[PDB]
Structure 1
Amino acid sequence: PADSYTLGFIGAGKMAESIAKGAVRSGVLSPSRIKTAIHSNPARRTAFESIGITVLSSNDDVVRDSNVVVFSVKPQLLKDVVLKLKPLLTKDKLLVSVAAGIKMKDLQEWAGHERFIRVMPNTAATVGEAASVMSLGGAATEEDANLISQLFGSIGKIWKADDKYFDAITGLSGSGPAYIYLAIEALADGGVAAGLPRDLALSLASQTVLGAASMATQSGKHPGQLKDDVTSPGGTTIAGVHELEKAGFRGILMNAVVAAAKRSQELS
């Protein structure tokens, strides 16, 4: 039903909006094939209506009218929401959760069936550059997985992974953007420290990060090869790299991923 399927969003937050916008913009879905439900927030109703999507008055009606249901409510609220909708969550409907930290075992127990996909996107869904990972429930089919890959492909990239990896993933793709935000600010501060105007420094920092990551994503090269490509003999770049290595830069980043992943596990 991939071509004509109806998608329903339970939870009308930013992630749902990003998905909806991405799918419409990429032609995966038309707005008439999407529904959401909102209560008592005007800004959010307007967000969906302004892209041509119908906002219904209840979660129940969104589920009834949807082949695929995406849950994006706050993780702490999800169990009760799925609970309440359970009679309507028939096995013919593919359920998807984007809730951070909620395992597949639990999603399946709450819904009462295993036709469930978990996707963990990250913050960059907003600009269509999410790093997402999906895990499949016990009854999710290969076709269900392709549908979801096509849907989340509209907001970034998507990879498959076993549910047991999702803590670590959270420490890397989930939390990693913050590490890069710090890097970007620090690079701009560095520019300014070196005598650059602040606006130029920040512009350059952000676009430098973007370009390097683009090289990494497109080049097919190991990052060490990419580093080798730009480190001319005795040049400026190696001088900067050397400072990084003196400080144990790589290990600091390893430490951040490990700590975030451990925190993820502790938070359950």
Structure 2
Amino acid sequence: IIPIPADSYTLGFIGAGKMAESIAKGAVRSGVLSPSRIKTAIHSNPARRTAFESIGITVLSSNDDVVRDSNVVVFSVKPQLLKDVVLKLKPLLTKDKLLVSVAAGIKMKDLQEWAGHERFIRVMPNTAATVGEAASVMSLGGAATEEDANLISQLFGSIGKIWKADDKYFDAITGLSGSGPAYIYLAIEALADGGVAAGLPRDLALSLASQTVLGAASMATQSGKHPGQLKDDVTSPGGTTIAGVHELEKAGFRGILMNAVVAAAKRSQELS
């Protein structure tokens, strides 16, 4: 358990999907890494190979060599495949390498057993990694150090925001930050549909819906205010806003979003 060189470490991606690509592009764009310090492996796909080569990253032909040449290894293969991929690589997963999983649903306990050591970090990002606005959370294996954690905070700080949480919260986090985008995509469509129902042109309605939601969320993220206080700031007496809010409350809007989160968290638990 030698510390990972903060400025000079090499990063290996096992699994070359969208999420790996988003992390690699983000890390390069923000200067956390240069492409020469990143490796990935691809077998079947010439298209995925292009995506990585086109940003200056060397694509090797085996997972084995990616691991050998990497200080930090990020596993992003489909969850059902991960176990076998880890077991295959096990002899090369020496304790001087920091391992990271972004696989949905795979608990720390299992990651550590498969790898045979506890220098492992688990990250659950979400779909907004693509535009650098992910909501990510990380949990630490029993041998992951504070310096390991900071290294991974910096890496994933390049695709959005990142927080720390106990592994036991990850089902619930899945129902909120993992699944929540889709609740907001519905909301944006419905707002647009509402604008059209009130007489707006479709393109304007949709533009305004998206940006209105973006704006409100930015107010929430930056203002340091409770959401109740933000709602109080825009609800003028007997005005348009409070009329709309009242309809939401009549229908139990808040409860409906609570139910979604809860059901999704419950499904996450059931999928084990």
Q: TM-score, normalised by structure 2?
A: 0.98
- SS of 2:110's partner is helix
The whole-number CA distance in structure 2 between the counterparts of 1:203 and 1:2 is: 42
Identical counterparts, % of pairs: 100
Deviations 1:131-155 (A, max 9, x none): 0000000000000000000000000
Deviations 1:233-263 (A, max 9, x none): 1111111100100000000000000000000
> How far off its partner does 1:40 sit?
1.6
Q: What corresponds to 1:129 in structure 2?
A: 133
> How far off its partner does 1:212 sit?
0.3
- SS of 1:210's partner is helix
Deviations 1:198-227 (A, max 9, x none): 111000000000000000000000000000
The whole-number CA distance in structure 2 between the counterparts of 1:237 and 1:244 is: 11
The whole-number CA distance in structure 2 between the counterparts of 1:143 and 1:111 is: 20
The RMSD of aligned alpha carbons is 0.4
Where do 5+ consecutive residues of structure 1 fail to align? none
- SS of 2:184's partner is helix
> How far off its partner does 1:2 sit?
1.3
The whole-number CA distance in structure 2 between the counterparts of 1:96 and 1:12 is: 14
Deviations 1:57-90 (A, max 9, x none): 0000000000000000000100000010000000
Deviations 1:14-47 (A, max 9, x none): 0000000000000000000000000121211000
Where do 5+ consecutive residues of structure 2 fail to align? none
The whole-number CA distance in structure 2 between the counterparts of 1:251 and 1:2 is: 45
The whole-number CA distance in structure 2 between the counterparts of 1:13 and 1:177 is: 20
The whole-number CA distance in structure 2 between the counterparts of 1:47 and 1:232 is: 50
Q: What corresponds to 1:142 in structure 2?
A: 146
* Displaced runs of 4 or more, over 2 A: none
- SS of 2:122's partner is strand
Query: Number of paired residues?
Result: 268
- SS of 2:39's partner is strand
> How far off its partner does 1:175 sit?
0.3
The whole-number CA distance in structure 1 between the counterparts of 2:179 and 2:123 is: 15
> How far off its partner does 1:4 sit?
0.3
Q: TM-score, normalised by structure 1?
A: 1.00
- SS of 1:196's partner is coil
The whole-number CA distance in structure 1 between the counterparts of 2:196 and 2:148 is: 50
The whole-number CA distance in structure 2 between the counterparts of 1:200 and 1:247 is: 27
The whole-number CA distance in structure 1 between the counterparts of 2:78 and 2:240 is: 47
User: Aligned to 1:103, which of 90, 94, 107?
Assistant: 107
Q: Does 1:43 align with 2:47?
A: yes
The whole-number CA distance in structure 2 between the counterparts of 1:40 and 1:101 is: 26
Deviations 1:73-121 (A, max 9, x none): 0001000000100000000000000000000000000000000000000
> How far off its partner does 1:181 sit?
0.5
